[PDB]
Coordinates of C-alpha atoms and ligand atoms in Angstrom, one line a residue:
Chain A
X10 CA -8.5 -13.3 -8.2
X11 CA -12.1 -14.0 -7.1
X12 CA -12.9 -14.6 -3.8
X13 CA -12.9 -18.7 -2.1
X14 CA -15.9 -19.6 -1.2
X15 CA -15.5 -18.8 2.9
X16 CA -14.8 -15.0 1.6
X17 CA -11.0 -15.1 4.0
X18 CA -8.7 -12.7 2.0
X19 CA -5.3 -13.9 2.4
X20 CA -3.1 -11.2 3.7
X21 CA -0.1 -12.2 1.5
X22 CA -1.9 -11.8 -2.1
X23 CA -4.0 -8.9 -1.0
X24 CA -0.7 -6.7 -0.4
X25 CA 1.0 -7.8 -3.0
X26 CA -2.3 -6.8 -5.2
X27 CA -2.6 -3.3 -3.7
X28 CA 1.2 -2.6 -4.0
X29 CA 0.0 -2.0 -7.6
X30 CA -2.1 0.9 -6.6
X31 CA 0.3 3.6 -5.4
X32 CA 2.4 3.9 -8.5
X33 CA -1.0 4.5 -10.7
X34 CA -1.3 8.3 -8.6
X35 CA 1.9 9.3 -10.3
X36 CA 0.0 8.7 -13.8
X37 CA -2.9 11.5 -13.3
X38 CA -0.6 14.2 -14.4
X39 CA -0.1 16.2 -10.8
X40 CA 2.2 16.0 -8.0
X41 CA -0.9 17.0 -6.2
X42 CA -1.6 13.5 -5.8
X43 CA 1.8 12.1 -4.5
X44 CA 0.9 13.1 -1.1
X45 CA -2.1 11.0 -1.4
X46 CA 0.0 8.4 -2.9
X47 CA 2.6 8.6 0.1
X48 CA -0.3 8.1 3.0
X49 CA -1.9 4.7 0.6
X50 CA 1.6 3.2 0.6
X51 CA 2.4 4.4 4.3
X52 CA -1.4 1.9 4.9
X53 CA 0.0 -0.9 3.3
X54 CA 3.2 -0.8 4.4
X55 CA 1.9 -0.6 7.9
X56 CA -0.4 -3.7 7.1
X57 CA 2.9 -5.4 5.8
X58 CA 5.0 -5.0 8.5
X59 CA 2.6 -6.4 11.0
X60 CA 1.9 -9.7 8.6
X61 CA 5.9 -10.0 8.4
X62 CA 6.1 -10.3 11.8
X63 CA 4.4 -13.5 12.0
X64 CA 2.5 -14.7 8.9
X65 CA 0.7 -17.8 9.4
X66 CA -1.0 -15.8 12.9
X67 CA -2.0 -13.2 10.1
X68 CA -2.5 -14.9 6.9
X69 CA -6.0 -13.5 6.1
X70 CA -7.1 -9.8 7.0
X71 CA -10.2 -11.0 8.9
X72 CA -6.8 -13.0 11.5
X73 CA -5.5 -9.3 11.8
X74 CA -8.4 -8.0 12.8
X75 CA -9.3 -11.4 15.2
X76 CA -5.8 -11.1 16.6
X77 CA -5.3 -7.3 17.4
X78 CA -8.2 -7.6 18.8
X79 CA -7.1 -10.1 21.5
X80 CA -3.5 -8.3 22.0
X81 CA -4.7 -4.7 22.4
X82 CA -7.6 -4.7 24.2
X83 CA -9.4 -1.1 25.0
X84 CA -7.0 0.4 22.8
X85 CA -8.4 -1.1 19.8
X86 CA -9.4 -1.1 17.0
X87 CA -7.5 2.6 16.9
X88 CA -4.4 0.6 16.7
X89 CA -1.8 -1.4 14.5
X90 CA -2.5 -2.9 10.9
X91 CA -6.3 -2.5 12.3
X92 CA -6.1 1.0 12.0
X93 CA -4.0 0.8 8.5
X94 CA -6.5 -1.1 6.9
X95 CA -9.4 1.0 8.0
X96 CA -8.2 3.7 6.1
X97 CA -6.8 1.7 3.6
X98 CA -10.2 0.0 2.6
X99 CA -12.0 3.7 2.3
X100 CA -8.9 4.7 -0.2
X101 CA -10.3 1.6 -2.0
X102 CA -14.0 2.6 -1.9
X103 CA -12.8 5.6 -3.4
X104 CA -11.3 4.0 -6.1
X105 CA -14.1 1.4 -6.5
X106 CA -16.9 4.3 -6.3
X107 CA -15.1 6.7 -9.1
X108 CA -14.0 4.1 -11.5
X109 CA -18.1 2.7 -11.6
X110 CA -19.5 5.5 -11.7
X111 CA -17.1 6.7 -14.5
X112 CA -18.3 3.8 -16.0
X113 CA -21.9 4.2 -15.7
X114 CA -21.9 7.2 -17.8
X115 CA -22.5 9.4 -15.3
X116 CA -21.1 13.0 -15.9
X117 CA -21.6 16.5 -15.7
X118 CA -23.2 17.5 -19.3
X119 CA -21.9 21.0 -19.4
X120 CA -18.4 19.4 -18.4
X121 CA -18.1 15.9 -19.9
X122 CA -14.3 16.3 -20.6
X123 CA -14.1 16.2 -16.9
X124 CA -14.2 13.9 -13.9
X125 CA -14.7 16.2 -10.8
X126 CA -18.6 15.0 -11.0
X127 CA -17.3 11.0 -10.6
X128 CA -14.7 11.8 -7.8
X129 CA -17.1 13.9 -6.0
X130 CA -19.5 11.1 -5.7
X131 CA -16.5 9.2 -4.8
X132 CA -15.7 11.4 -1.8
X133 CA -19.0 11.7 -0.5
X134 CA -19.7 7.9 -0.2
X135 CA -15.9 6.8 0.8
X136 CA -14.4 9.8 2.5
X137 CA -16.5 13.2 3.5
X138 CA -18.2 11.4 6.3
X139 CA -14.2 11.0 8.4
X140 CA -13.4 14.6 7.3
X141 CA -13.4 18.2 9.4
X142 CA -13.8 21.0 7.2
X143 CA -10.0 21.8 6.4
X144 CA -9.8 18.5 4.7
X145 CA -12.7 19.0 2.5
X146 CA -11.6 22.4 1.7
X147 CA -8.3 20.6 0.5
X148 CA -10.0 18.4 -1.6
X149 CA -12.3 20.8 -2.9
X150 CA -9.1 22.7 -4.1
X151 CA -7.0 18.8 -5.4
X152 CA -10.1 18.3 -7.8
X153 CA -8.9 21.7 -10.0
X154 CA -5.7 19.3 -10.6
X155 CA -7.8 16.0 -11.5
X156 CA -7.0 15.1 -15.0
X157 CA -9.1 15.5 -18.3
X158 CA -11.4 11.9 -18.7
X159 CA -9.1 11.2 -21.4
X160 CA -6.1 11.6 -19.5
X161 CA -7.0 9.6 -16.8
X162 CA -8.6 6.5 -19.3
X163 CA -4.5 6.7 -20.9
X164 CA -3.5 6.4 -17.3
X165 CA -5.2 2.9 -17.0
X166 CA -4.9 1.2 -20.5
X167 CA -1.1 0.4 -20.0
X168 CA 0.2 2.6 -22.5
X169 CA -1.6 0.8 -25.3
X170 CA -3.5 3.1 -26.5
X171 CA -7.5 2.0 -26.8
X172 CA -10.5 3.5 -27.6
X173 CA -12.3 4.9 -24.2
X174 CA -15.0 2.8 -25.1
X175 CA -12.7 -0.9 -24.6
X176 CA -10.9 1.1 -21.5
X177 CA -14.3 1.0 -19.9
X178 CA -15.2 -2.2 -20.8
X179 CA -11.7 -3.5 -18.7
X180 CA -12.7 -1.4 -15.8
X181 CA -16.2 -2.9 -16.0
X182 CA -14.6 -6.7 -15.5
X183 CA -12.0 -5.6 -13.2
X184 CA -14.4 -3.9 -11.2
X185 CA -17.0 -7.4 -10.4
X186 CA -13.8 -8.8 -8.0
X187 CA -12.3 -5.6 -6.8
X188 CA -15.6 -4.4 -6.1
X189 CA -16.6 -8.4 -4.5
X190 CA -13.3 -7.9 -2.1
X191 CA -13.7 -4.5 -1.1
X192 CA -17.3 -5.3 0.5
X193 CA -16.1 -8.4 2.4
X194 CA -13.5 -6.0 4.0
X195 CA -16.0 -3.7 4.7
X196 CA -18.4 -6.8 6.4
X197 CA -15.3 -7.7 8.5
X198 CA -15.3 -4.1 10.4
X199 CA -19.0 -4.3 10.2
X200 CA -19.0 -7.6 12.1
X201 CA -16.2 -7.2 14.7
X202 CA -17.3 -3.7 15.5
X203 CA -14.0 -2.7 13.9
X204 CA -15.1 0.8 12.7
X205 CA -14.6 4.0 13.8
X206 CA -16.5 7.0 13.2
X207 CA -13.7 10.2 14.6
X208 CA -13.0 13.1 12.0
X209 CA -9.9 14.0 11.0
Chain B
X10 CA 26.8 15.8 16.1
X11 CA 28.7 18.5 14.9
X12 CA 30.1 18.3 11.1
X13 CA 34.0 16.2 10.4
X14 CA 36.7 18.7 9.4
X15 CA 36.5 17.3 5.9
X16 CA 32.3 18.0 6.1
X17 CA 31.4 14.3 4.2
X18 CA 27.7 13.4 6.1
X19 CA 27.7 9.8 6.9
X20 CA 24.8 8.4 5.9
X21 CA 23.6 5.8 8.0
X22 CA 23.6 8.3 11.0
X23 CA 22.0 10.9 8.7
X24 CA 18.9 8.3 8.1
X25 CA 18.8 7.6 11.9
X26 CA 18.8 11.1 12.4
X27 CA 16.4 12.5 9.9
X28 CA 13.9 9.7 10.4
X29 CA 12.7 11.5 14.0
X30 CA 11.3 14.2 11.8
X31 CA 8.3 12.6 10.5
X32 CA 6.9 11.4 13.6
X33 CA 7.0 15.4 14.4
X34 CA 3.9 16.3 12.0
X35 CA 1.8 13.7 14.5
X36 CA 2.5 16.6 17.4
X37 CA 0.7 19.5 15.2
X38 CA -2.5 18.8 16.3
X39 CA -4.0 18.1 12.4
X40 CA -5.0 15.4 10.4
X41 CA -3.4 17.5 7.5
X42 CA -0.3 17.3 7.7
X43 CA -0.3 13.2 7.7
X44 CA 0.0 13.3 4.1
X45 CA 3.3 15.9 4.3
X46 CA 4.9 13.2 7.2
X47 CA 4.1 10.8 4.6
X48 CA 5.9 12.3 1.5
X49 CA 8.8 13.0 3.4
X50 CA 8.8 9.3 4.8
X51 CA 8.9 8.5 1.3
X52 CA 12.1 10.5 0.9
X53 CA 13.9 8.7 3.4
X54 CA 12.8 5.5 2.4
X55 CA 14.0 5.9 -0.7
X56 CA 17.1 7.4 0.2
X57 CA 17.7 3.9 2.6
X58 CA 17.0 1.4 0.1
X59 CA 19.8 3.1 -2.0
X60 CA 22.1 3.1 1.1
X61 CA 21.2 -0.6 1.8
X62 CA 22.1 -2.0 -1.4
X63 CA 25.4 -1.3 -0.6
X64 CA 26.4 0.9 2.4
X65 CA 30.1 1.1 1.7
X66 CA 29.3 2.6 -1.5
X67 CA 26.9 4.6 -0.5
X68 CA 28.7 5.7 2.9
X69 CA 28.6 9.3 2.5
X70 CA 25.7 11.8 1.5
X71 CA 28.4 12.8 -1.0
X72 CA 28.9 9.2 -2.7
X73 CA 25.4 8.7 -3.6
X74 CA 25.3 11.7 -5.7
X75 CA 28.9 10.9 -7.1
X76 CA 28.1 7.5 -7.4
X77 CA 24.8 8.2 -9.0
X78 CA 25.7 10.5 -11.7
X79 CA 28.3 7.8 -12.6
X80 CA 25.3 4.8 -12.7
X81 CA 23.2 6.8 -14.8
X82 CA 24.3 9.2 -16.9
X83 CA 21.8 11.4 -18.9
X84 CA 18.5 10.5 -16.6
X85 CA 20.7 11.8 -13.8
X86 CA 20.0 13.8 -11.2
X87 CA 15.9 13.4 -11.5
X88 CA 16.7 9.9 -10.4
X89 CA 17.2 7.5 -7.4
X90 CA 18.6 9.0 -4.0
X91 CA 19.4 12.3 -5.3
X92 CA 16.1 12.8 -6.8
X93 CA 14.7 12.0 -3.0
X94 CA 17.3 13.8 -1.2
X95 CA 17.1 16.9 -3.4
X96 CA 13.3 16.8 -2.1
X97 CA 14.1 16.2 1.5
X98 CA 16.7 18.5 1.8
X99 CA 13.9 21.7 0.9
X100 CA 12.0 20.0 3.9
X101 CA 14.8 20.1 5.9
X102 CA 15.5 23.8 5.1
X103 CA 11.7 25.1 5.0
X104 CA 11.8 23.4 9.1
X105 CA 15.5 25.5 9.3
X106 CA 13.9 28.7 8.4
X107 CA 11.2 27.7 9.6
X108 CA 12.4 27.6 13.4
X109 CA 15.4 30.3 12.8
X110 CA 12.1 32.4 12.0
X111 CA 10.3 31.7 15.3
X112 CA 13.4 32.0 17.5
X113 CA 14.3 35.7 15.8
X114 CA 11.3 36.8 16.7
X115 CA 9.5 37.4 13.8
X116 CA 6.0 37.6 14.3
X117 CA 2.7 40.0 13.1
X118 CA 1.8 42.0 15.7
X119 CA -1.7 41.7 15.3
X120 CA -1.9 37.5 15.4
X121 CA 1.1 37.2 17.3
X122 CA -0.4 33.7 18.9
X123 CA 0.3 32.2 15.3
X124 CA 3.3 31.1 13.2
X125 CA 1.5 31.8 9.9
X126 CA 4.4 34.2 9.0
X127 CA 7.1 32.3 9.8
X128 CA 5.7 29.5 8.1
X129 CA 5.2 31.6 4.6
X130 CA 8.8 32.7 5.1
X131 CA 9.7 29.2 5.4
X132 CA 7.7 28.4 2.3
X133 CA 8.8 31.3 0.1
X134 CA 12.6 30.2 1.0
X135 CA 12.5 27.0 0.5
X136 CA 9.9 25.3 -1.2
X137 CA 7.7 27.9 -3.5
X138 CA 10.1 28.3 -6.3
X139 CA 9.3 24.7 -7.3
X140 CA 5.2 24.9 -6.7
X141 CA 3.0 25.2 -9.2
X142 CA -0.2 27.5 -8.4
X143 CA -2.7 24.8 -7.4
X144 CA 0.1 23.3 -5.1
X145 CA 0.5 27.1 -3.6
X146 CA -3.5 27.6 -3.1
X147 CA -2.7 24.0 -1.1
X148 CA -0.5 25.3 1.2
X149 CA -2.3 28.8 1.5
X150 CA -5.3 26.6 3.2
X151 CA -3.2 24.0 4.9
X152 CA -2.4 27.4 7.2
X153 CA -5.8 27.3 8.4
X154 CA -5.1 24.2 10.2
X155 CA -0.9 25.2 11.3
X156 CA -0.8 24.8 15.3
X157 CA -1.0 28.2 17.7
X158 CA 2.3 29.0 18.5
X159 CA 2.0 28.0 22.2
X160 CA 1.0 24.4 21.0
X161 CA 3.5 24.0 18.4
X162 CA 6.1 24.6 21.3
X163 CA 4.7 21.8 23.3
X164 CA 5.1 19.4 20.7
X165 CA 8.7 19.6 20.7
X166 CA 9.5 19.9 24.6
X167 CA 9.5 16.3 24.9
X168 CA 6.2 16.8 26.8
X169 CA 7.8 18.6 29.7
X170 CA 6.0 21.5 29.9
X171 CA 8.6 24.2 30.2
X172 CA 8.4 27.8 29.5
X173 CA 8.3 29.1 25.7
X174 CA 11.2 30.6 26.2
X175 CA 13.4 27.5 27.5
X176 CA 11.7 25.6 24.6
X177 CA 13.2 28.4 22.4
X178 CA 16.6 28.1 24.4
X179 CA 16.8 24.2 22.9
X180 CA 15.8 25.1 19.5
X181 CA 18.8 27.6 19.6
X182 CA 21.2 25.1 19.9
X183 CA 19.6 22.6 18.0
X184 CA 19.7 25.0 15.0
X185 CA 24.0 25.4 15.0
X186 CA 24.4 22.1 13.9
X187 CA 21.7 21.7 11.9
X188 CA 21.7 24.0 9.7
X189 CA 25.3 23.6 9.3
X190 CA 24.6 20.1 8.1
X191 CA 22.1 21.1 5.5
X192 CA 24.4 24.3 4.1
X193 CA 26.6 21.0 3.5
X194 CA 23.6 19.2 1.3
X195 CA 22.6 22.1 -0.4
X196 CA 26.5 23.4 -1.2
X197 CA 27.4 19.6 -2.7
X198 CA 23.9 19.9 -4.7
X199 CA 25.3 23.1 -6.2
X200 CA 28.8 22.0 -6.6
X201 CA 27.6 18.7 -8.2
X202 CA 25.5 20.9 -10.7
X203 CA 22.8 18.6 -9.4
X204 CA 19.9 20.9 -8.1
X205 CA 16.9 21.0 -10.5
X206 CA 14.5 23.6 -10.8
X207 CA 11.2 22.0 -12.4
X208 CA 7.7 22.8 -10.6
X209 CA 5.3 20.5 -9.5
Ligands
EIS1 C1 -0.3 20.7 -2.8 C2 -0.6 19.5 -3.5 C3 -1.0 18.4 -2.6 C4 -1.8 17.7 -1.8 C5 -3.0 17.0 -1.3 C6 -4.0 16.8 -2.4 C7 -5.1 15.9 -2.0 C8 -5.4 15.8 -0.5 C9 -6.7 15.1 -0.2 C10 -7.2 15.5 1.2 C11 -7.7 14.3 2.0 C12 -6.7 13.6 2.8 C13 -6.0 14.4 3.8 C14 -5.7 13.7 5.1 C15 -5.4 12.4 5.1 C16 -5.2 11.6 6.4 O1 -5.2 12.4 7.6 C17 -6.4 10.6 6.6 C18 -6.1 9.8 7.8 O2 -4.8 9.1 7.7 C19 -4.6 8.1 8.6 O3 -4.6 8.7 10.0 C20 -4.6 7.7 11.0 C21 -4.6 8.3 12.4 O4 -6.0 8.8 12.5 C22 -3.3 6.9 10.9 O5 -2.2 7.8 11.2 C23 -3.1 6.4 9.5 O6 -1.9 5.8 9.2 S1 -1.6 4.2 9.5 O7 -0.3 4.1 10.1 O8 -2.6 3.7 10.5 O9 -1.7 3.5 8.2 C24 -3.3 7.5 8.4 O10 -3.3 6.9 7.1 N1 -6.5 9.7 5.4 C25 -7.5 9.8 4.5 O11 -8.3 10.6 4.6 C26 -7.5 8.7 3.4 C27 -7.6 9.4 2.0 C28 -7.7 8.4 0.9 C29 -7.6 9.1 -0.4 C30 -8.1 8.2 -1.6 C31 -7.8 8.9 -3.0 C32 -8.4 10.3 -3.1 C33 -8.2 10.8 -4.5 C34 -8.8 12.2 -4.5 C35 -8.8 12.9 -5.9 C36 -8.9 14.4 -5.7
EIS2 C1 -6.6 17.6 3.4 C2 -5.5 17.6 4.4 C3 -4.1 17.5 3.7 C4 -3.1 17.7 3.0 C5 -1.9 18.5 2.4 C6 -1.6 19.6 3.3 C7 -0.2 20.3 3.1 C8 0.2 20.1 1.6 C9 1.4 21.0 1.3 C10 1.5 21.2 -0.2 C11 2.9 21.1 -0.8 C12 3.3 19.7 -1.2 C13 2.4 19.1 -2.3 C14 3.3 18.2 -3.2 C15 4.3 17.6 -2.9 C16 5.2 16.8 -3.8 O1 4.7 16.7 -5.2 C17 6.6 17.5 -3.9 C18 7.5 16.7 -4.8 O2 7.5 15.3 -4.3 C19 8.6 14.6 -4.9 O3 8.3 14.4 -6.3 C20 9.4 13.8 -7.0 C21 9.1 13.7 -8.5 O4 9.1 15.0 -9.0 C22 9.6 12.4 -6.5 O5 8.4 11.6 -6.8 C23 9.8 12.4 -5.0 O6 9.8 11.1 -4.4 S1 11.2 10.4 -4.2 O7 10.8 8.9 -4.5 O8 12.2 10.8 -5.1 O9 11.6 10.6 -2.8 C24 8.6 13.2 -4.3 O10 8.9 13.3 -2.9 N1 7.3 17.6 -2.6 C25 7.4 18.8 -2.0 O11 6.9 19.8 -2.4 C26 8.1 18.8 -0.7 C27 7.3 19.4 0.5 C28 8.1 19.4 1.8 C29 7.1 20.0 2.9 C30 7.9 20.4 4.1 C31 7.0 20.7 5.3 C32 5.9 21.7 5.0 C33 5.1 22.1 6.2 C34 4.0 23.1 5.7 C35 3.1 23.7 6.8 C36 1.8 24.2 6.3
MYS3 C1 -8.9 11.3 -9.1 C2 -8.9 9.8 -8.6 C3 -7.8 9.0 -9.2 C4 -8.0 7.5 -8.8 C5 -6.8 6.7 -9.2 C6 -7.2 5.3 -9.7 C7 -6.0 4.4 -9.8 C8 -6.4 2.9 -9.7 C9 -7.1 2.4 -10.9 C10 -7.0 0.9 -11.0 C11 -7.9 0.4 -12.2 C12 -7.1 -0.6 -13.1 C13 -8.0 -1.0 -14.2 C14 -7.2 -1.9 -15.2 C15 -7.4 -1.3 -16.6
MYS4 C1 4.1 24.0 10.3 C2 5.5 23.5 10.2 C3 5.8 22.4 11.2 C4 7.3 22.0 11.2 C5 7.5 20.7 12.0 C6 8.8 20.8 12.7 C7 9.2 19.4 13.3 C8 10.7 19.3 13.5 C9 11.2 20.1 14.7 C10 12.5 19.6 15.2 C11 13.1 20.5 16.2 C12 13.5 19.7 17.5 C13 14.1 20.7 18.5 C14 14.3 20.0 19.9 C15 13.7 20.7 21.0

């Protein structure tokens, strides 16, 4: 859904829209990926059991952040859904940097069946900055399990079976909102001096 | 606690037992192994919603694959709670050999400050017959980032700081009844015909 005009994302709808995104790791071919589908869902579920425990006090993401704040003092903002959804929101920058760039044509011309160029990107803009070297390596190694272009479009056209050409076009109008939301998360950590900058 | 004469595991106190395992892979001292706390998280969560729908049912380790194969037939056993707990138990016995390893005293001479070798024994035992390559060249670099021996024994000394060989003392004992506890799962896994032998 777009965003109201004051920008507050309520907590409620967000998790139930990023619930979707787990399960969509388990369509890219490799059980490489579930781990990275297990520590996604561990984020939400993190965020969702600190909005369950009182939900009016955290109905939008920007009260999480406002309230934390006020209950954990020096310890945050390495703490609680805080610290969920600060990893959470560079999983979604991933997502958000390798689907547009998929769909602005770029790609590597002596590999064009693949999409290690469009997740490299990806990495480097969402990711490579909060990584030691172990962790890149790691990556670096996933990407030789990253599905064929093709593969992953089938993974997104629910089955249906499309040309590549109208599976872009749906990324294309998905991505104006989920691209919107994604920036006024990242503003919120901006603003409250939410971020952190430590390596794992 | 030690096995019942008739050997059925109860599975509520199996859950509340297993599920101090995960928070163990925060104590390695690397960012890579979150994802590997997170998978097998996933196990037990799976395995508890299963349990939860109906713990009379469900009230033995043994039921939920009896009960499963008899709620869905042909998809059966790459399904439900004994599709997770045929994945948890291979954690469970890569950490077995895993520890026996350390406490026999296996070590290489030449880096005896690691556990590189008992890990790889560990892997090869448990886990490698059902990894693909790309999943193997992920756990060859993972060692890169496995704790020095000396550390890994602090994380499981409750902080104390006792000697390594009191630490190993504990892990002794802890070892008679849980190994015995996951012979059990991997005996009704065979007896069941419900082991599978697919890669990822
Ligand atoms: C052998 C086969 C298997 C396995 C592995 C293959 C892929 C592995 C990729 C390596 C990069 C990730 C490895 C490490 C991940 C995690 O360590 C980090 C921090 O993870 C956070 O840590 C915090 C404490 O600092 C809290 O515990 C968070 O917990 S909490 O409780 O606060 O919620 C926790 O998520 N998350 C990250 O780096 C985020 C990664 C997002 C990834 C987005 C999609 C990437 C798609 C890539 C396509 C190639
Ligand atoms: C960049 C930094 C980060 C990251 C990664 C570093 C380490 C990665 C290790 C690579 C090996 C694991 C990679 C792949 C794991 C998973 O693909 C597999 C199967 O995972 C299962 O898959 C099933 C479907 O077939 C169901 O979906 C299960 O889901 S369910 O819903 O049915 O419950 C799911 O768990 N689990 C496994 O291979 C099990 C692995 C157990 C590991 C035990 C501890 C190992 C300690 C090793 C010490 C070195
Ligand atoms: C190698 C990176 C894989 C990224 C996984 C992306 C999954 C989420 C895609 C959601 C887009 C849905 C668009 C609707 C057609
Ligand atoms: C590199 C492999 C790491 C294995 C993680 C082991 C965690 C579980 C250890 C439980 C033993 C508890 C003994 C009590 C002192």
């Amino acid at each position: 859904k777009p965003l109201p005009a004051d920008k507050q994302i309520e907590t409620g709808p967000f998790l139930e829209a990023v619930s979707h995104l787990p399960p969509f790791f388990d369509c890219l071919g490799s059980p490489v990926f579930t781990p990275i589908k297990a520590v996604i869902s561990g984020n939400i579920t993190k965020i969702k059991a600190v909005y369950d425990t009182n939900p009016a006090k955290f109905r939008t993401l920007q009260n999480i952040l406002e309230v934390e704040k006020e209950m954990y003092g020096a310890e945050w903002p390495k703490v609680g859904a805080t610290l969920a959804l600060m990893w959470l929101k560079r999983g979604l920058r991933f997502i958000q940097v390798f689907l547009q760039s998929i769909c602005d044509g770029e790609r590597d011309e002596n590999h064009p069946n693949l999409i290690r160029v469009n997740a490299t990107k990806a990495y480097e803009m969402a990711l490579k900055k909060y990584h030691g070297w172990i962790v890149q390596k790691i990556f670096q190694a996933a990407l030789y399990a990253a599905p064929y272009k093709s593969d992953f479009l089938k993974a997104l056209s629910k089955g249906q079976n499309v040309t590549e050409e109208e599976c872009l076009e749906k990324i294309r109008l998905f991505l104006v909102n989920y691209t919107a939301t994604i920036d006024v998360i990242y503003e919120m950590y901006t603003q409250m001096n939410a971020e952190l900058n430590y390596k794992v």
